[PDB]
């Protein structure tokens, strides 16, 4: 877990338009996700992992132990049953709602968190660097 504890700013976005349209967004979130950079501050605060996802329109946060299932009202407009865990040096956020699933595979490539967001076959590759 210690290589993920940082301020993470999005530097190169593969597919940040069709992933939002496939997931089921309100159209103002599709306008916001094309224009705005998210600052993802992954932080162990006391004991549990608090991720703060902060941009200049949408600002949301998630507090978890590894394995915690929690309902999460997202920037899409959906409450998802969310399970977060490390698989093999890769942080996987599994969001479950209405029969549908997406998982965000966060992996450290030489100091850089590569977030691979799979909605099945709709895959976005978002390249986060430290500040």
Curated annotation (Swiss-Prot):
GO BP term (any one): nervous system development
Task: Tell me which SUPFAM superfamilies the record gives.
Answer: Lipocalins
Pfam families from the UniProt entry: Lipocalin
Q: Mostly located where?
A: cytoplasm
PROSITE patterns tied to this protein: FABP
In this UniProt entry, the residues modified to N-acetylvaline are: 1
Residues annotated as binding a fatty acid are 126-128
| A GO CC term attached to the entry | cytosol
> Could you say which protein family the record assigns here?
Belongs to the calycin superfamily. Fatty-acid binding protein (FABP) family.
Which purpose does this protein serve, as stated in its record? B-FABP could be involved in the transport of a so far unknown hydrophobic ligand with potential morphogenic activity during CNS development. It is required for the establishment of the radial glial fiber system in developing brain, a system that is necessary for the migration of immature neurons to establish cortical layers.
Q: What is this protein called?
A: Fatty acid-binding protein, brain
- In its UniProt entry, the species of origin is given as Homo sapiens
């Amino acid at each position: 877990v210690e290589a993920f504890c940082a301020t993470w700013k999005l530097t190169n976005s593969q597919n940040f338009d069709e992933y939002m349209k496939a997931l089921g967004v309100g159209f103002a979130t599709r306008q916001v996700g094309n224009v705005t950079k998210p600052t993802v501050i992954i932080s162990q605060e006391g004991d549990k992992v608090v991720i703060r996802t902060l941009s200049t329109f949408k600002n949301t946060e998630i507090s978890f132990q590894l394995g915690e299932e929690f309902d999460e009202t997202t920037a899409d407009d959906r409450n998802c049953k969310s399970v977060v865990s490390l698989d093999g040096d890769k942080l996987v956020h599994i969001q479950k709602w209405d029969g549908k699933e997406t998982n965000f595979v966060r992996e450290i490539k030489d100091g850089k968190m590569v977030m691979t967001l799979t909605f099945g076959d709709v895959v976005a590759v978002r390249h986060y660097e430290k500040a």
